[PDB]
């Protein structure tokens, strides 16, 4: 199929700062990826983003009834929906399962990678640190970064490049909003 | 800071529309346009809230009407295909014979039309598969997830096969037990 495609998108965005203390509503219209007109509650009128949107900003800005609907949205729409969802979104807290397993950077002979697998958590902000004998190890650390699972959970792997020696204690430490103190998992050769 | 977005789209000539709500990058729900039903991304959401799915159809009708106007206004300038990036991962560390889930993450593409097949040992598998709708990105491309629960073995290999009009050939992303 090579028939040309045409895409319209609309994003009605509600931005919250300190709960509902400060709220910004952004009504955004797109043709393919090009935002062409928007309503910003900071302005209170539509503005053309590109020349493609100038006819809509002129026309819609001429209709005071339309504008007052948009001007009310921070209250009637944003703050209302925030109230509806806040308890299972803003306040959602799922703590991570933490697994530590050894691996190899390339097929070698000896495991030379310690993987700290941090799975199933929400929200996304997390701090994962590696320790050797209680001193933090900051060199040779690499990660997948933060991975969305698409189901309201995240995961991340944080790997330490090291040749483990007997007598060494390795600790992966996880800090996350769902936790009241750091989660630590130990590993020994 | 949190962000709630009501994201809509309408695509010609496919005449496909979508209506969903997003919280901080995760889908709260979308409207099944054919059934006119609200589909909560987690079941527990539907016990805490409701949404009159019928009203999503009004938005899509306006968006279809706006698309015809903008298409004409643009002198019929069509979309440029952006092919996806594809990643295959599991949602937990893999243990032999311990049930797990393969995730196929399809990212950074447009238009929002894709064919995705899970292959086990080169053969399509459909038992137990699920998927998300097209999810919006802040750069106004799309992303999507497909899922395959599975029993990890040494004798099975897997691929996520993605077809998209911006790809020259299907993109196959492999997974096997290390």
């Amino acid at each position: 199929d090579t028939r040309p495609r045409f895409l319209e998108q609309v994003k009605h965005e509600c931005h919250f700062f300190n709960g509902t203390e400060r709220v910004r509503f952004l009504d955004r219209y797109f043709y393919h990826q090009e935002e062409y007109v928007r309503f910003d509650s900071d302005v209170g009128e539509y503005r053309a983003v590109t020349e493609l949107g100038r006819p809509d900003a002129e026309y819609w800005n001429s209709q005071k009834d339309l504008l007052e609907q948009r001007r009310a949205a921070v209250d009637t729409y944003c703050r209302h929906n925030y109230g509806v969802v806040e308890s299972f979104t803003v306040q959602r807290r799922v703590y991570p399962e933490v697994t530590v397993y050894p691996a190899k950077t390339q097929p070698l002979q000896h495991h030379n990678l310690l993987v700290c697998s941090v799975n199933g958590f929400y929200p996304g902000s997390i701090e994962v640190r590696w320790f050797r004998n209680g001193q933090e190890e900051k060199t040779g650390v690499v990660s997948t970064g933060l991975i969305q699972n698409g189901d309201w959970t995240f995961q991340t792997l944080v790997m330490l490049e090291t040749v483990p020696r007997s007598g060494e204690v390795y600790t992966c430490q996880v800090e996350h909003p769902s936790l009241t103190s750091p989660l630590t998992v130990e590993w020994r050769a | 800071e949190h962000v709630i977005i009501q994201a809509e789209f309408y695509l010609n000539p496919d005449q496909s529309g979508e209506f969903m709500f997003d919280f901080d990058g995760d889908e709260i729900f979308h409207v099944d346009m054919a059934k006119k039903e609200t589909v909560w991304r987690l079941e527990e959401f539907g016990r805490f809230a409701s949404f009159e799915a019928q009203g999503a159809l009004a938005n899509i009708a306006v968006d279809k009407a706006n698309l015809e106007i903008m298409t004409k206004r643009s002198n019929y300038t069509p979309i440029t295909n952006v092919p996806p990036e594809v990643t295959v991962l599991t949602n937990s560390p893999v243990e032999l014979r311990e049930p797990n889930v393969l995730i196929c993450f399809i990212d950074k593409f447009t238009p929002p039309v894709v064919n995705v097949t899970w292959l086990r040992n080169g053969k399509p598998v459909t038992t137990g598969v699920s998927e998300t709708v097209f999810l919006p990105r802040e750069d106004h491309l799309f992303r999507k997830f497909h899922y395959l629960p599975f029993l990890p073995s040494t004798e099975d290999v897997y691929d996520c096969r993605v077809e998209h009009w911006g790809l020259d050939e299907p993109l196959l992303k492999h997974w096997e037990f290390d």
């Binding site: 809509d56 026309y59 929906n81 | 409701s50 938005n59 306006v62 968006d63």
Partner: peptide, 13 residues
């Protein structure tokens, strides 16, 4: 506990 949708604005022909 009812989600509110906001209307999309209609361009003129």
């Amino acid at each position: 506990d009812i989600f509110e949708r906001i209307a999309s604005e209609a361009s003129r022909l």
